[PDB]
Amino acid sequence: HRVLHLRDRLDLAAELKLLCERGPLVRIPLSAVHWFALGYDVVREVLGSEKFDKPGNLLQLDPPEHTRLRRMVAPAYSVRRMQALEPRVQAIVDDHLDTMASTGPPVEFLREVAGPMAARVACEFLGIPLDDRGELIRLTAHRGGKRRRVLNGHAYLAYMRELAARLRRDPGDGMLGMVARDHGADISDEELAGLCAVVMNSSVEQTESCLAAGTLLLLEHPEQFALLRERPELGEQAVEEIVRYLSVFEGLDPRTATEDVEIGGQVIKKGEAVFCSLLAANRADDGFDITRKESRHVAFGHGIHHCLGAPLARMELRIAFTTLVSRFPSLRTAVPAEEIRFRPPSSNVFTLLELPLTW
Amino acid sequence: PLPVTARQRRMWLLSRIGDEAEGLHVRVALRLRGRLDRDALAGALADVGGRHEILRTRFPGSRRDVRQEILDAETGRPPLEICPATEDELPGLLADRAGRPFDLTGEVPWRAHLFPLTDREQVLLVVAHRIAADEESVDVLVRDLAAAYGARREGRIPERAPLALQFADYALWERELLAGADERDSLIWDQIEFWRDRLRPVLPSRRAGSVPLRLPADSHARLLEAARSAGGTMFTAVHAALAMLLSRLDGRTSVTIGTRLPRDEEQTGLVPMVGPFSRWLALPVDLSGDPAFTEILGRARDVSEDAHRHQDLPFERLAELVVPVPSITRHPIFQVALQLDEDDVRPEESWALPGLRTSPVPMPEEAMELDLWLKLLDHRTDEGDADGLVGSLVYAEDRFDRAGAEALAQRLVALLEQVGAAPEVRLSQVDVP
Numbered sequence A: 001h002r003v004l005h006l007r008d009r010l011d012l013a014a015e016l017k018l019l020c021e022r023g024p025l026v027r028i029p030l031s032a033v034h035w036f037a038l039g040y041d042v043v044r045e046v047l048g049s050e051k052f053d054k055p056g057n058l059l060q061l062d063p064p065e066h067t068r069l070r071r072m073v074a075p076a077y078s079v080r081r082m083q084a085l086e087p088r089v090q091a092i093v094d095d096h097l098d099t100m101a102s103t104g105p106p107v108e109f110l111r112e113v114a115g116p117m118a119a120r121v122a123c124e125f126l127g128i129p130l131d132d133r134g135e136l137i138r139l140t141a142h143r144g145g146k147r148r149r150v151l152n153g154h155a156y157l158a159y160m161r162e163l164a165a166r167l168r169r170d171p172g173d174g175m176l177g178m179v180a181r182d183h184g185a186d187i188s189d190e191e192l193a194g195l196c197a198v199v200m201n202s203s204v205e206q207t208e209s210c211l212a213a214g215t216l217l218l219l220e221h222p223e224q225f226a227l228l229r230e231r232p233e234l235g236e237q238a239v240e241e242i243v244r245y246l247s248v249f250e251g252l253d254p255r256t257a258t259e260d261v262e263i264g265g266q267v268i269k270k271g272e273a274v275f276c277s278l279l280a281a282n283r284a285d286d287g288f289d290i291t292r293k294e295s296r297h298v299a300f301g302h303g304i305h306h307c308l309g310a311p312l313a314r315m316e317l318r319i320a321f322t323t324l325v326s327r328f329p330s331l332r333t334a335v336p337a338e339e340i341r342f343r344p345p346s347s348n349v350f351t352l353l354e355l356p357l358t359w
Numbered sequence B: 001p002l003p004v005t006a007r008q009r010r011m012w013l014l015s016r017i018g019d020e021a022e023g024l025h026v027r028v029a030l031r032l033r034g035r036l037d038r039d040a041l042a043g044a045l046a047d048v049g050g051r052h053e054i055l056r057t058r059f060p061g062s063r064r065d066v067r068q069e070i071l072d073a074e075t076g077r078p079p080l081e082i083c084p085a086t087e088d089e090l091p092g093l094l095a096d097r098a099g100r101p102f103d104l105t106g107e108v109p110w111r112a113h114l115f116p117l118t119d120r121e122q123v124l125l126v127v128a129h130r131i132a133a134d135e136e137s138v139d140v141l142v143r144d145l146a147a148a149y150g151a152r153r154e155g156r157i158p159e160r161a162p163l164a165l166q167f168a169d170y171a172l173w174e175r176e177l178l179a180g181a182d183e184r185d186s187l188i189w190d191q192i193e194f195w196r197d198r199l200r201p202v203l204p205s206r207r208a209g210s211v212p213l214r215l216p217a218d219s220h221a222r223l224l225e226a227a228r229s230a231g232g233t234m235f236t237a238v239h240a241a242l243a244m245l246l247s248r249l250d251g252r253t254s255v256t257i258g259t260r261l262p263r264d265e266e267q268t269g270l271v272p273m274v275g276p277f278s279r280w281l282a283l284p285v286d287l288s289g290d291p292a293f294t295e296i297l298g299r300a301r302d303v304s305e306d307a308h309r310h311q312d313l314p315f316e317r318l319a320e321l322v323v324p325v326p327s328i329t330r331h332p333i334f335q336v337a338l339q340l341d342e343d344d345v346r347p348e349e350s351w352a353l354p355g356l357r358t359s360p361v362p363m364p365e366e367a368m369e370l371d372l373w374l375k376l377l378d379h380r381t382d383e384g385d386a387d388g389l390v391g392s393l394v395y396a397e398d399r400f401d402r403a404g405a406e407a408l409a410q411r412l413v414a415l416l417e418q419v420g421a422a423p424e425v426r427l428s429q430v431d432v433p
């Protein structure tokens, strides 16, 4: 059952490739009977069907509560708003790549470039007081010490209650400003803090993971690294190809079937939880090619729970990847590829442990 | 007329002693690799001072009375020395600048010393007098300096939610719920009565060294085992062991160690602010008769519960009430202190000035009044089982040398291993040569 997260490096491990040969939807009895959705069309079905089920945490919410919170937050990612945010993100990307260059090579790209960049973009998008960003990261990070995590939770909730009061009086820009503007007392400080914390934490983890592993992925295809510098209009396609190839969100939470459904010839009884492997559906048809048009992938999910931050993620990844490849043509890894350590299969996102880069 | 606190009162007095005695300061040295915007660093330093009134607070007065004079951000910004150096001479410069005394009557209680090494590498030292900053304030200092620098390096004023409480509010709160000192059966009166019944060079240097102290998991497990057996913690197990060692070394039937507690974690408003929030707790244990380690573990456990039920009276005020002839060369009530910490995230790993590769520069042990400060890490497996006890015996140089401290550390490790493997051992039949 751990096979869904076994990888070579960025590539599918052999055991997972043998499993995907066994059709795009397999049943597996353990203890209970689980299901693996491994195909693009099969994963779309099990996510787009109304026959499955799973504060401020949209991903663990279900209708009608999921609808109530998704409605208030969704217009924050509008096409016009993301376009208005581009020059700010571009300046943020340029600054971090200035720090990267001035500090000089080598650089630990993940914690010194990618992480700070993702969190700075996420905080400008949220409308967080721009210099309380470090404090909100620190108070909501998952660094252990359960008493400390509870105390940090108490301190962050107190800050958010003061910020929500300030915002509900006279709001401002950012997702938090709009949610406080269009909705007052319709959303609580708890839900406001939950939405904000999901953005600057797990969403930042995925963004920084795409930035780091995406950089490595471009580095290991140098002709496409140069091609993106040569034809920067390929950025949108390159990002769609990168997120498809990386699949940092490898597997999804189980979609327990509320009815007895037959996606294919195999019957799924009510209660047989089906696990979506976006990594398999994206990588089992395949090579990296940023010139591909109309990328066919499920890297941002599907159905009512499809990624709410995909507009910002795509936007930020395009600006970062295209700016990076043109600013560092001689960019390379500072260590041999074998020394590149990847997170052990832990079911919660896929990422590098670190990315030593030089130029 | 803004009052000071009991701790500030004691810190102010001990600050008038001179260069020979190392200043009682907290300090942090940061290695900053990259292009540093010196004028932004100066602005960010002033911004931290503007954010925390106590960092721009001055302490004029005399032996009978000290006052908190809060300056504005500009007049009262911290001084910033720029001292070009080579790595060669950084150890001596950091020690000297960290020890330079403060004139708290006409100076803000912190300062910064920048040491340019190259155009892309500097070392920054921040010193703050303990009248204004405790151990936890150093983390707050660096984090707020990082937040202010990131904004200043972009030609912008720091945009942060201000402090809900200032330390002036804490000083008045202490002057309030404490004013009932002379009133039968009052809250603090009950506590003042509790501690009464419960309880060398003429000029100190306060220089501290440290020797390592390691206990293998085997003996660590047996102490945790005996601690659980008596309803105590690992702190209680080491407290009892240390109380036996000091009892035999000094030949005394009544040993009193202390422990430093941080700011009140319940009062959540104190979380993001700089201040002398260190609370000290005496833990007097009576070893009368000839108690066994299990029995001493009980006495240690019982005094820790009663003491934590009586921690609203500040240690410095209690000192004034039970010390007849106070000494600047021997710490009041206790001279040995014990810290037992569970493993946790290190704040130094998460210090980052935007635009600069930030990493901490080690400094010598902090100046202290204690003779011995045993700081131990209580390592555990994911299940909570003992996984070694690792730490340092911080010793006063005016009182021990490295050999005398190593002999002490080894003597305690032996005692720890003995009482763990035989918790019924009496105080008299314990092995301390």
Ligand code: HEM
Residues within 6 Å of the ligand: A058, A059, A060, A070, A122, A198, A199, A203, A204, A206, A207, A210, A243, A247, A248, A249, A252, A253, A298, A299, A300, A301, A302, A304, A305, A306, A307, A308, A309, A310, A312, A313
């Ligand atoms: C700024 C960046 C991002 C933000 C703000 C963001 C936000 C969110 C939110 C709020 C949800 C839950 C929506 C709901 O349940 O209705 C979600 C789900 C999801 N996100 Fe993102 N996200 C970001 C980046 C990414 C990236 C880079 C990936 C790469 C794989 C990703 C993959 C997913 C997936 C697959 C889901 C659906 C999970 C499931 O259905 O079980 N997201 N995202």
